Design an enzyme around this catalytic site. Structure first.
Site, PDB file in Angstrom:
ATOM      1  N   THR A  41      -6.048  -4.439  10.885  1.00 22.46           N
ATOM      2  CA  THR A  41      -4.739  -4.104  11.578  1.00 22.46           C
ATOM      3  C   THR A  41      -3.562  -4.016  10.602  1.00 22.46           C
ATOM      4  O   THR A  41      -2.652  -3.456  10.901  1.00 22.46           O
ATOM      5  CB  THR A  41      -4.252  -5.404  12.490  1.00 22.46           C
ATOM      6  OG1 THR A  41      -4.655  -6.626  12.059  1.00 22.46           O
ATOM      7  CG2 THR A  41      -4.883  -5.085  13.933  1.00 22.46           C
TER       8      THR A  41
ATOM      9  N   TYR B  65      -1.763  -2.664   7.031  1.00 17.21           N
ATOM     10  CA  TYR B  65      -1.393  -1.151   6.530  1.00 17.21           C
ATOM     11  C   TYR B  65      -2.493  -0.795   5.510  1.00 17.21           C
ATOM     12  O   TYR B  65      -2.946   0.275   5.829  1.00 17.21           O
ATOM     13  CB  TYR B  65       0.065  -1.368   5.804  1.00 17.21           C
ATOM     14  CG  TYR B  65       0.527   0.108   5.270  1.00 17.21           C
ATOM     15  CD1 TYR B  65       1.020   0.939   6.067  1.00 17.21           C
ATOM     16  CD2 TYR B  65       0.523   0.123   4.017  1.00 17.21           C
ATOM     17  CE1 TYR B  65       1.378   2.195   5.819  1.00 17.21           C
ATOM     18  CE2 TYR B  65       0.879   1.540   3.490  1.00 17.21           C
ATOM     19  CZ  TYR B  65       1.589   2.467   4.270  1.00 17.21           C
ATOM     20  OH  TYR B  65       1.896   3.569   3.907  1.00 17.21           O
TER      21      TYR B  65
ATOM     22  N   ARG C 294      -9.766 -10.548  15.751  1.00 14.11           N
ATOM     23  CA  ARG C 294      -9.494 -12.147  16.056  1.00 14.11           C
ATOM     24  C   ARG C 294      -8.711 -12.259  17.576  1.00 14.11           C
ATOM     25  O   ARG C 294      -8.067 -10.973  17.862  1.00 14.11           O
ATOM     26  CB  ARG C 294      -8.696 -12.680  15.068  1.00 14.11           C
ATOM     27  CG  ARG C 294      -8.112 -14.053  15.335  1.00 14.11           C
ATOM     28  CD  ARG C 294      -7.723 -14.872  13.977  1.00 14.11           C
ATOM     29  NE  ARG C 294      -6.466 -14.062  13.226  1.00 14.11           N
ATOM     30  CZ  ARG C 294      -6.759 -13.083  12.509  1.00 14.11           C
ATOM     31  NH1 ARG C 294      -7.845 -12.731  11.969  1.00 14.11           N
ATOM     32  NH2 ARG C 294      -5.649 -12.299  12.132  1.00 14.11           N
TER      33      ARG C 294
ATOM     34  N   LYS D 209      -2.506  -2.272  18.429  1.00 10.34           N
ATOM     35  CA  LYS D 209      -3.621  -3.165  17.766  1.00 10.34           C
ATOM     36  C   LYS D 209      -4.922  -2.895  18.606  1.00 10.34           C
ATOM     37  O   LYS D 209      -6.069  -2.846  17.833  1.00 10.34           O
ATOM     38  CB  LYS D 209      -3.282  -4.663  17.327  1.00 10.34           C
ATOM     39  CG  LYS D 209      -2.365  -4.901  16.565  1.00 10.34           C
ATOM     40  CD  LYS D 209      -2.249  -6.205  16.331  1.00 10.34           C
ATOM     41  CE  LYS D 209      -1.026  -6.804  15.340  1.00 10.34           C
ATOM     42  NZ  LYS D 209      -1.068  -8.096  14.949  1.00 10.34           N
TER      43      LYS D 209
ATOM     44  N   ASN E 291      -0.390 -15.189   5.323  1.00 12.86           N
ATOM     45  CA  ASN E 291      -1.664 -14.178   5.282  1.00 12.86           C
ATOM     46  C   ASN E 291      -2.667 -14.371   4.065  1.00 12.86           C
ATOM     47  O   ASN E 291      -3.486 -13.785   4.053  1.00 12.86           O
ATOM     48  CB  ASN E 291      -1.107 -12.779   5.426  1.00 12.86           C
ATOM     49  CG  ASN E 291      -0.187 -12.342   4.617  1.00 12.86           C
ATOM     50  OD1 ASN E 291       0.826 -13.365   4.161  1.00 12.86           O
ATOM     51  ND2 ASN E 291       0.051 -11.317   4.167  1.00 12.86           N
TER      52      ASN E 291
ATOM     53  N   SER F 281      -7.614 -10.150  -0.937  1.00 14.73           N
ATOM     54  CA  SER F 281      -6.386  -9.184  -0.607  1.00 14.73           C
ATOM     55  C   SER F 281      -5.428  -9.186  -1.922  1.00 14.73           C
ATOM     56  O   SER F 281      -4.425  -9.977  -2.034  1.00 14.73           O
ATOM     57  CB  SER F 281      -5.384  -9.452   0.683  1.00 14.73           C
ATOM     58  OG  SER F 281      -4.467  -8.538   0.797  1.00 14.73           O
TER      59      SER F 281
ATOM     60  N   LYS G  40      -1.997 -15.688  -4.424  1.00 14.42           N
ATOM     61  CA  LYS G  40      -3.263 -14.827  -4.890  1.00 14.42           C
ATOM     62  C   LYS G  40      -4.136 -15.257  -5.835  1.00 14.42           C
ATOM     63  O   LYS G  40      -5.359 -15.264  -5.845  1.00 14.42           O
ATOM     64  CB  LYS G  40      -2.518 -13.569  -5.428  1.00 14.42           C
ATOM     65  CG  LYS G  40      -2.143 -12.474  -4.373  1.00 14.42           C
ATOM     66  CD  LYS G  40      -1.555 -11.186  -5.011  1.00 14.42           C
ATOM     67  CE  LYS G  40      -2.007 -10.022  -4.277  1.00 14.42           C
ATOM     68  NZ  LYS G  40      -1.154  -9.717  -2.904  1.00 14.42           N
TER      69      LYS G  40
ATOM     70  N   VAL H 283      16.008  -0.444   0.852  1.00  8.22           N
ATOM     71  CA  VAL H 283      16.862  -0.230   1.971  1.00  8.22           C
ATOM     72  C   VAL H 283      16.509   1.003   2.933  1.00  8.22           C
ATOM     73  O   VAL H 283      16.824   1.279   4.149  1.00  8.22           O
ATOM     74  CB  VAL H 283      18.467  -0.302   1.595  1.00  8.22           C
ATOM     75  CG1 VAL H 283      18.942   0.915   0.425  1.00  8.22           C
ATOM     76  CG2 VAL H 283      19.318  -0.033   2.844  1.00  8.22           C
TER      77      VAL H 283
END
EC number: 1.23.1.1
Lengths: 304, 304
Positions: free
Chosen positions: B10, B12, B33, B42, B85, B108, B131, B165
């Site tokens: 789901t 990017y 999930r 989703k 995440n 990731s 990470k 921005v």
């Protein structure tokens, strides 16, 4: 020919309208607001629009003549606003009035027909009154109009088997609302978008209300479940839910999801989508038979 | 005939990795999930994987066996989690360790090489800690790996002309970071996804770090601006912003805007993606020249 401005193109149905108008052959303009800038999946969405030939028009609801500027360009405006998001449409209504070039407006109506919801349930009623406010602005300005009503979105009512709190078929247990013998109207959102693309330059729906009641997709909640049972080869164990156990503990015991639960009742308990009847001259599947609308057995196949 | 599970579809980069696997020719399994039977966009992502041939796999991070099961259907699990995440990956790495059947794992990281980030300071540092905390847990279980680093996503750093921005080109003014002569890597995210789909199966990279560094896409923000004003024909009023003024008063700003300020600094002032050199055994575009990856000219052209 027939230049069309779409406002609300980031919305669930408004994605589909833009792509339905591109494929129907309109010159499709899409209003871009201070949209993203901020949110990625709405720039890319807009990029995907222009890679198919949509023309981007910048504008803001805060800036009244930027809105007049969007609507100078086109013959037909279509709104799909999915805070008070229905009542902001009135800022656009008087932009269309000041501009005067507009041959038709289609306000953000794609659910229950509002003037038939006079004795709806609070807080759910707010939707229909806010939408009726917009109609009146339209008719008081003398802006020619078309209102697209009539059908539950298959994604929100048909792929979940009309359950709440989920958007997918259940694995063993399903609730039936009342006896499950009340008829509801389901329509694939793509087919509502296509019917929207075809009706906006149709002379026979000017200043009229178009119903979307595709005959094969007029179903009781129980038939819809049986469709799923036949595709799967498994019965679901079914609990019937009496009317007053349905609104049990609405009181203010859920956040205004109370509005959704009430709309559900009007549809599945009172059958307001089917309690009247409509002619062929005002229903979408008769008016555009060339559209091969997805039946609900095919919609459900997508989940096997 | 390579089997791949994609966890985090789901997200990017998650979306495309799923789509790039299918286009390269792997049997692409996608973890679904409980979180997703909510939020239409989703479910309607996931069923558009189905229409492209992906196979849906159900499981929960909170149910260690369900991840055990999924991870057994596959030869390689790819993770792409775009907070909580990053370290929820750890409870996948145990589901892959107890599994034993997985020939490669890809955690990731599609950002900057974390063991070079010994120098940033909180709060920007933490995602590098997390990470490598998940890498130390991968190398500890001995699960064979591939880490895929070293490129700015073109959507987040190119199409906005490296303005924070916003994510769209500036209409009149731009901020040049430094004299703006620090050159960094820009990769179209589609290109990052197809690279990952091809290094997935490839013996060259197993247990090594592969860098996404397109030759013609190593630019500083200054020429990338000039690229845009070629395509546009107008000159943009530049305003150089000196390193100390850019981090003036950072400790007194909201603690994700700190993180972003720190992030932009490593890239556009410290040169973290350029402070280094890499050869051909180690640099995606050379190991896969069958990619005609998109250069920031053609990318920025999508916006005019």
């Amino acid at each position: 020919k027939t230049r069309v401005l779409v406002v609300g193109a980031t919305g669930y149905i408004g994605k589909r309208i833009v792509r339905a108008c591109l494929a129907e052959g309109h010159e499709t303009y899409v209003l871009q607001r201070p949209e993203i800038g901020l949110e990625i999946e709405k720039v890319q969405l807009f990029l995907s629009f222009k890679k198919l030939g949509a023309r981007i028009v910048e504008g803001s609801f805060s800036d009244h003549q930027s809105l007049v500027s969007a609507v100078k360009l086109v013959d037909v405006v279509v709104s799909a606003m999915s805070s008070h998001n229905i009542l902001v449409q009135l800022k656009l209504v008087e932009a269309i009035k000041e501009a005067g070039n507009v041959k038709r407006f289609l306000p953000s109506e794609f659910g229950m027909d509002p003037p038939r919801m006079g004795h709806a349930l609070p807080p759910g009623r707010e939707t229909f009154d806010q939408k009726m406010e917009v109609r009146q602005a339209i008719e008081a300005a003398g802006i020619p109009y078309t209102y697209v009503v009539g059908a539950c979105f298959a994604a929100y009512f048909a792929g979940n088997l009309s359950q709440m709190v989920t958007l997918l078929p259940p694995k063993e247990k399903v609730n039936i609302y009342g006896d499950g013998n009340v008829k509801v109207v389901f329509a694939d959102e793509d087919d509502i978008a296509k019917y929207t693309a075809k009706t906006l330059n149709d002379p026979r729906t000017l200043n009229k209300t178009v119903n979307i009641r595709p005959p094969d997709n007029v179903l009781t909640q129980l038939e819809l479940v049986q469709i799923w049972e036949k595709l799967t080869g498994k019965e679901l164990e079914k609990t019937n839910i009496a009317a007053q156990d349905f609104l049990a503990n609405i009181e203010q015991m859920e956040i205004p999801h109370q509005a959704g639960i009430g709309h559900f009742y009007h549809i599945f308990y009172e059958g307001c989508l089917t309690d009247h009847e409509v002619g062929e001259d005002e229903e979408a599947s008769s008016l555009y038979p060339d559209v091969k609308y997805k039946r609900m057995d095919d919609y459900l196949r997508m989940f096997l």
